[PDB]
């Protein structure tokens, strides 16, 4: 029904604004509505701009795997899995159904990867600890940026040193300089670094603490 | 009607954003619409992402109880209560109806527990008293975090020392240091601690009080 | 129509968030739609959570009155007025209609009282005059909290000393200390107290007034 | 057989003395003997005193859940699940059998909760470290009291600060005073606290150590 298509469009941000929204909606519809190849063209054509759809389609074709489970750029294999022109898939046949299943899976992959927005290498670098922001709150914002703007899971054990380095570099300057000077820095987990940053953050100075220090200095000399 | 399903989706945050919203909507629908097992698959499939649904389904299976009222991980019992594949339940039979009742109850449990978001042990620690925030207002925010992000009821008598310790640790530093030094601290109720914190909060200094203190010091010397 | 029920739900906050919203909607519907007992179960079941509905139902049963106009906890009387299980009320009979009228009235009472949220004894105490807030503006916020979070009408003559005491206690500290010291304090109306607080609020000091005082002090010595 | 009933009674402590004993025996019998409602009355009537049985029965009725999986105090629902008077349950019917299953489950719940003995808030506070008792041995006794006399599992992550506070408060006075003074106390796990207490416990003084200190003081002056 065109009312469904337009409602989906109108109740969500554009793909470019926030890819997660439409991707999740389309992932759901791909299941509940079991769209054919033509139906998928209407979905994409209605919910995405020309430039977004193109990104998604190339990303979907890049997600095709050969029978050895590895990527393939062989035209015939790519075309057979994710055709750009109407295929002869017959939904009354197991053959047709299997192609439809795969097509939908690849379409989803395409959207997920096109959303990735080319490892937002700048959005992650732009997460800097605020002057009042606790180290744990800053770390959560930094992890959120990794999730949204990179393909790397900040909770993976293999990403720990990577997240740790961003955490040290992008902490407030006093904190970052002290974390950098920690003894056996290589041995510090992300949790260790947060605890060390908290010691600096919590055992610092405050306007009341500055008034107390000024009073103690005036009592001294 | 697909219009109902999509309306429910579009008028609520995602499950991940705020699990309470969709959980309450689904709890209601489970009653008013008396869904079958297939209907429940459409509900879940339409309102949740693939990753959310999975969490919910495993949480629902973890909520199954044996005839002795205790948890069970026995495949046959788990499968019989909360099947992952279409069951042969016939709604025209008391047997079918009872399974449907239980299934819906477990589905709800699954959502409630999946929402729990693994005892947000960080969200509770992140509630810190603001510099202008009264102790009672801070305590209410702290209790709200316990409710939303842990399975513990902050109003339970058995949670009092737990909430008390968070209250002391996460109060503004001047207040927390004084609460920690209270005589017979073990004997203080949560209400006592709030009253003691209020004494510090209210009998402190203000910019007008600082101007008065500076005037009194200038009158002194 | 399920569209009406779901529209009512989706266009309002939850009962817990703001009880007034749904209570007013349901009060209206109880009149325009003249619901039967089953209809009321759908209303409640759809618009309230399990925990909210329970609160409302117990509150409704607590609102039942005997023939002497007084509360009654006599099971038969409570059950007859507000049955928890489907009653045999026949809307084609004056008997059935009268029970329906009473049921709807009690349902409304239940919601009104369940909303009361147990005399939010903390929300009223949490209304504190802001540093720039006029005494009359503060008093209006304090009265709003009485209305929303207690069963007491702050405009009732019998509540005047009660509101007066909250007004004095929760005024800005300089104001509250002076109001407390007023001669013949017992004789002061709420209006008197507001006028006395205004004298303190308006005849105080300002940054321009502080600059003028500093200039006068520098001219003095 | 009355011999079984009296043997069970005579080979166990009373419910009041140690609820776990009879509860475990009855849980077993409820399974192996598949008792009817009347059989359960004989079990309870024979193994419990009048006052114990009453506690158990009210606790069992308090454990009844509605179809939404939540507690219910609706007379008809409570009565239907756990009747105080002989029900018409026919064990030759699936309907009768299901009620029997539920009844037995609720009976067990009732006993488990009646045993709880109202969160023995005093038994837990009464666990104090002995003068020769190691911190780990004391902690195990403290956890045992939580298990026996509260509904809280001392091994739950959400109970850690609660157990930690009891551990600090009820440690031997020298130990408790030092644990209270630990830097970053909020950051200490239960395991950390035990290790810190062990440092105090093991690096203290002994009668031989006192003789050595007296000899060193006599050598000094």
Author numbering:
A (entry chain A), B (entry chain A), C (entry chain A), D (entry chain B): 16 to 236
Structure paper excerpt:
Immature MLV particles were purified from the culture medium of HEK293T cells transfected with a proviral MLV plasmid containing a mutation in the viral PR gene. Subtomogram averaging was performed essentially : subtomograms were extracted at positions underneath the spherical viral membrane and were subjected to iterative alignment and averaging, resulting in a structure of the hexameric immature CA lattice at 6.6-Å resolution. The structure shows two distinct curved layers corresponding to CA-NTD and CA-CTD. The CA-NTD forms a hexamer in the immature lattice, at the center of which is a parallel helical bundle formed by helix 1, surrounding a central pore (black hexagon). Hexamers are packed together by a dimeric interface in which the C-terminal end of helix 7 (black arrowhead) interacts with the loop between helices 4 and 5 (red arrowhead). After fitting the CA-NTD and the truncated CA-CTD into the electron density map, there was clear density projecting toward the center of the particle that was not occupied by the domain structures. This density comprised six extended rod-like densities consistent with α-helices, running parallel to the sixfold axis ∼15 Å apart (black arrowhead). In the CA-CTD, an additional density is seen for helix 310b in the subtomogram averaged structure (black arrowhead), indicating that the helix is present in the immature virus and is not an artifact of crystallization. The CA-CTD dimerization interface involves interaction between helices 9, as is the case for other immature retroviruses, but also seems to include an interaction between helix 310b and the base of helix 9 in the vicinity of W184 (Q192 in HIV-1; Fig. 3B, asterisk). Here, we show that, in immature MLV, the CAH at the C-terminal end of CA forms a similar helical bundle.
Immature retroviruses are built by the Gag polyprotein; Gag is then cut into domains, and the resulting CA capsid proteins form the mature capsid, which can mediate infection of a new cell. The CA domain and immediate downstream residues mediate protein interactions in the immature shell, and, following proteolytic cleavage, CA forms the mature viral capsid.
